[PDB]
């Protein structure tokens, strides 16, 4: 029990779903009933790879073997759903947590804000933060980062200033993720004065090494063959808290680069993430489907993903080219086609390949291009400002 749970935790931490599945099969093949904690590690790994179907099967199997889910199990699902913006499934857990006798802790509130944010529900995201303070609790550093992303996403420059300065008002030294979100909201409004003001703060950074290297590489100082090894050195050091922290770091970084005009640099940063296992669902290239999955990405990251995907399309035929913007129960509804990600991807595709990618009549969160229309198709310019 101790060895099985130890290995599965590592698989769930690093998002190695294939290894986690084999440990579960090995335990069953030896007539061993895995513990409730062991299944939670398997559920964690599937959520790291956006394999929601296999994650909910393991959750279903927990009750079958009598290993009822613990509080940590309902957190593995919430963080898995939060990254994809599946607030419909997040509310199912929340409506289940109140019935299961589990009070809402702080971690539950953070996932709720993150799920609503990624799902485009900006009004409901701040309401959770509004209702969180009424219930007392104690917002942590990620909660401040959770609500800062909401304001940064909906282009609130003055709200983002107040949120960001208060982070350092308590001598917290906000992480590199919050700095990259400041660059996005300043880069979205073309506020080039504030961008240079924040960059000089990240250039000195005598205390934190990651801010210095990442801040330097954004400006383009580290774009040399030998000078890209230092940037890679930081990425390998950050590639030790698992895929959970990595996806948050790359989403903010690509968002900052795209809004600052460093669109060619964002292409190489995304290429650095994929080889490290980040965004394993991003691309599929077989004879049937050529797909790009952007439901767990930021707006800047999605644009970078589409730009590379479109350029690679023109190089080469599959039966279909699809863009997965909504991946959940919201697909079977009209709300998915009104999602901010779905509209942004379609708007991005409209003025890059003319009217070649149209919606689907059978799914709200898909943007397809038939094989016949693929014949009638760089397509996107990737340059640094």
């Amino acid at each position: 029990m101790e060895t099985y749970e130890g290995i599965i935790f590592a698989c769930g931490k690093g998002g190695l779903h294939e290894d986690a599945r084999k440990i579960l099969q090995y335990m069953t093949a030896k007539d061993v009933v895995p513990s409730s904690k062991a299944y939670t590690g398997v559920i964690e790994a599937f959520g790291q790879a956006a394999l929601y179907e296999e994650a909910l099967v393991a959750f279903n199997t927990m009750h079958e073997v009598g290993s009822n889910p613990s509080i940590e199990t309902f957190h593995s699902l919430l963080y898995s759903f939060a990254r994809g913006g599946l607030f419909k499934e997040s509310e199912v857990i929340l409506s289940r947590l109140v019935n299961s006798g589990i009070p809402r802790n702080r971690d539950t509130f953070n996932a709720t804000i993150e799920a609503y944010k990624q799902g485009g529900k900006f009004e409901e995201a701040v309401k959770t933060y509004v209702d969180m303070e009424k219930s007392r609790c104690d917002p942590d550093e990620r909660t401040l980062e959770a609500v800062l992303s909401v304001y940064s996403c909906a282009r609130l420059v003055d709200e983002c200033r107040e949120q960001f300065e208060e982070m350092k008002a308590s001598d917290i030294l906000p992480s590199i993720m919050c700095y990259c979100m400041m660059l996005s909201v300043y880069g979205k409004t073309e506020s080039w004065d504030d961008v240079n003001e924040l960059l000089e703060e990240m250039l000195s950074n005598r205390v934190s090494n990651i801010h210095q290297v990442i801040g330097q590489m954004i400006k383009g100082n580290y774009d040399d063959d030998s000078n890209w090894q230092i940037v890679e050195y930081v990425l390998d050091k950050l590639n030790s808290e698992g895929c959970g922290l990595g996806i948050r770091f790359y989403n903010a970084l690509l968002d900052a680069l795209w809004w600052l005009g460093q669109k060619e640099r964002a292409a190489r940063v995304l290429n650095e993430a994929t080889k490290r296992g980040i965004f394993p669902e991003l691309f599929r290239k077989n004879k049937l489907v050529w797909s790009v999955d952007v439901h767990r990405m930021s707006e800047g990251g999605m644009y970078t993903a589409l730009s590379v995907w479109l350029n690679d399309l023109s190089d080469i035929l599959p039966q279909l080219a699809v863009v997965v913007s909504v991946r959940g129960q919201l697909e079977k509804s009209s709300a998915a086609r009104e999602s901010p990600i779905t509209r942004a991807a379609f708007s991005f595709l409209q003025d890059h390949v003319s009217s070649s990618f149209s919606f689907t009549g059978w799914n709200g969160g898909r943007i397809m291009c038939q094989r016949s229309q693929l014949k009638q198709l760089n397509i996107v310019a990737l340059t640094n400002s």
């Binding site: 959750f59 279903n60 199997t61 079958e64 499934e89 199912v92």
Partner: peptide
Amino acid sequence: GTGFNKGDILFYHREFC
């Protein structure tokens, strides 16, 4: 006379919805 001739799958496997 009357003595003659000796007289759970499909559970916990539903749609999450």
